[PDB]
């Protein structure tokens, strides 16, 4: 209701449950780039559905919902990957039947996955991060009274997810200090994910340009939204 | 000493003073792109000097020092600008004698400046942010025992700057909660600055490619480091 919003009245545990229930279905893959863009294409359908279930999200205009999707899709895909590969050091689990390794975007992705493991990132935190990406990546790329009213909403939901995260950390045995150091640690990693997304976008765009065959519709649509 | 490091033994106020003393000299400008790349070129000299004085920085290898500079230079330039223009709504103060306005990278830069104003960002916080950019932007783009020892250092200094920031906020009248919400707010903005840096880099590169005249040496060197 963007004023009576259900998202602002959710406790930290409620928020966490909602996010966990919203988690998309495990997908499997069906050349190497072709397997990746196929998976990517199919995950995007499920991510559009996932976003609906993210507290605060349906309270924005449809155009703003689409803008956030267009802005954050790769980062979201990437944080998923980085997360799946957390336990496979030197490897990238794109799907259970698609695991690759060591021996550069892929290297940045491996490092990030390592960083997560060394921090021992938790599934409850993961889902928090993924939503922040959704709500934040587009936000300074939307002017008007409605525009700032939308921005103010997103900022309010983001503050709400911060509280959750902080709550989670406190629930586990962590000093106030340790809480704000881990919060900082995790958010700074999203800088790197933005960066990787910008590089992956450039890469994907190259392949499009040098391939003759246009690749999947949805995936192409989310790529074209950038530029 | 990266073990006896002076940076890890600095209190929050000490850290803040050091950062403030390290602040570079006000520069003035001397076509529009030519004025901007000139200023940019001249600021870079002073930023190399500024970095030396950033606690923790001289404790890294020289190659890692250069890598961090090459990685973070535009973001740092941009956070400077965004900060200078905070008080000139709809305008960008590149230098006191170079002020531009409204009527897109520049728009992202204005929005960020607005965001800062609405948050009423403080000079003590500004300098904290600028250093985090320095220490963080390159860090997941450095493998070996020394490599992780460097990473562990940077992470330790970053944790130290988090404490400072949090301290500052507490010093001003802020709830624990307000502290972790503002910390989140500020770090998420660095995602956007990374993003803008990636876009500005692409832009700068275009101008280089379509201009015949090569522009300034230092500036060209920091651009070439990307790619
Ligand atoms: C967008 C993206 C494709 C889709 C990716 C994706 C999909 C789903 C998902 O859930 C998460 C993510 C996360 C990352 C997403 C990719 C990042 C950029 C992309 O376009 C690519 C790649 C790609 C792939 C391969 C696979 N490669 C495997 C192999 O050679 O068999 C096939 C390819 O060379 O054709 N190589 C490179 C470049 N390669 C550089 C090179 O080898 O010199 C990176 C490297 O392998 O380390 C880039
Ligand atoms: C790298 C950079 C030049 C240096 C910049 C800088 C320098 C020092 C510093 O302390 C901070 C920063 C922060 C930003 C830095 C710029 C971002 C990208 C850059 O290459 C540019 C520009 C630029 C400039 C101008 C100036 N422009 C002013 C004017 O037209 O007279 C001259 C130009 O058109 O030649 N226009 C555009 C694109 N323009 C798109 C266009 O107008 O359709 C943006 C727009 O004006 O909103 C891009
Ligand atoms: Eu490859
Ligand atoms: Eu222009």
From Swiss-Prot, chains A, B:
Biological role: Nuclear hormone receptor. The steroid hormones and their receptors are involved in the regulation of eukaryotic gene expression and affect cellular proliferation and differentiation in target tissues. Ligand-dependent nuclear transactivation involves either direct homodimer binding to a palindromic estrogen response element (ERE) sequence or association with other DNA-binding transcription factors, such as AP-1/c-Jun, c-Fos, ATF-2, Sp1 and Sp3, to mediate ERE-independent signaling.
Domain named NR LBD: residues: 11-226
Region feature Self-association, mapped onto this chain: 1-227
Residues of the full protein shown: 301 to 548 of 595
Encoding gene, per UniProt annotation: ESR1
PTM notes: Phosphorylated by cyclin A/CDK2 and CK1. Phosphorylation probably enhances transcriptional activity. Self-association induces phosphorylation. Phosphorylated by LMTK3 in vitro. Glycosylated; contains N-acetylglucosamine, probably O-linked.
Stretches the record annotates as Interaction with AKAP13: 1-227
Effect the entry attributes to changing residue 76 to C: Loss of transmembrane localization, no effect on peripheral membrane localization. Impairs activation of estrogen-induced activation of NOS3 and production of nitric oxide. No effect on binding to ERES
Family per record: Belongs to the nuclear hormone receptor family. NR3 subfamily.
Other notes: Selective estrogen receptor modulators (SERMs), such as tamoxifen, raloxifene, toremifene, lasofoxifene, clomifene, femarelle and ormeloxifene, have tissue selective agonistic and antagonistic effects on the estrogen receptor (ER). They interfere with the ER association with coactivators or corepressors, mainly involving the AF-2 domain.
Lipid-modified sites (S-palmitoyl cysteine): 128
Domain commentary: Composed of three domains: a modulating N-terminal domain, a DNA-binding domain and a C-terminal ligand-binding domain. The modulating domain, also known as A/B or AF-1 domain has a ligand-independent transactivation function. The C-terminus contains a ligand-dependent transactivation domain, also known as E/F or AF-2 domain which overlaps with the ligand binding domain. AF-1 and AF-2 activate transcription independently and synergistically and act in a promoter- and cell-specific manner. AF-1 seems to provide the major transactivation function in differentiated cells.
Impact reported for residue 65 to H: In ESTRR; results in highly reduced activity
Residues reported to bind 17beta-estradiol: 43, 84, 203
Coiled coil: none
Modified residue annotations for Phosphotyrosine: 216
Disease (UniProt): Estrogen resistance: A disorder characterized by partial or complete resistance to estrogens, in the presence of elevated estrogen serum levels. Clinical features include absence of the pubertal growth spurt, delayed bone maturation, unfused epiphyses, reduced bone mineral density, osteoporosis, continued growth into adulthood and very tall adult stature. Glucose intolerance, hyperinsulinemia and lipid abnormalities may also be present.
Tissue expression pattern: Widely expressed. Not expressed in the pituitary gland.
Region listing for Transactivation AF-2, in residue ranges: 11-227
Summary of subunit composition and partner proteins: Binds DNA as a homodimer. Can form a heterodimer with ESR2. Interacts with FOXC2, MAP1S, SLC30A9, UBE1C and NCOA3 coactivator. Interacts with PELP1, the interaction is enhanced by 17-beta-estradiol, the interaction increases ESR1 transcriptional activity. Interacts with EP300; the interaction is estrogen-dependent and enhanced by CITED1. Interacts with CITED1; the interaction is estrogen-dependent. Interacts with NCOA5 and NCOA6 coactivators. Interacts with NCOA7; the interaction is a ligand-inducible. Interacts with PHB2, and UBE1C. Interacts with AKAP13. Interacts with CUEDC2.
Entry protein name: Estrogen receptor
């Amino acid at each position: 209701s963007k004023k009576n919003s259900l998202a602002l009245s959710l406790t930290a545990d409620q928020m966490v449950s909602a996010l966990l229930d919203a988690e998309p279905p495990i997908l499997y893959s069906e050349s190497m780039m072709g397997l990746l863009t196929n998976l990517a294409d199919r995950e995007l359908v499920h991510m559009i559905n996932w976003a609906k279930r993210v507290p605060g999200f349906v309270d924005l205009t449809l155009h703003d919902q689409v803008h956030l999707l267009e802005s954050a899709w790769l980062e979201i895909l990437m944080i998923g990957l980085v997360w799946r590969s957390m336990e496979h050091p030197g490897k990238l689990l794109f799907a259970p039947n698609l695991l690759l390794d060591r021996n550069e975007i892929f290297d940045m992705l491996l490092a990030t996955s390592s960083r997560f493991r060394m921090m021992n990132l938790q599934g409850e935190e993961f889902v928090c991060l993924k939503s922040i990406i959704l709500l934040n990546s587009g936000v300074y790329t939307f002017s008007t009274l409605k525009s700032l009213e939308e921005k103010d909403h997103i900022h309010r939901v983001l503050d709400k997810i911060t509280d959750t995260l902080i709550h989670l950390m406190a629930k586990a045995g962590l000093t106030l200090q340790q809480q704000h150091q881990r919060l900082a640690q995790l958010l700074l990693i999203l800088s790197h994910i933005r960066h990787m997304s910008n590089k992956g976008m450039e890469h994907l765009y190259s392949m499009k340009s040098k391939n003759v065959v246009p690749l999947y519709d949805l995936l192409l649509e989310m790529l074209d939204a950038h530029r």
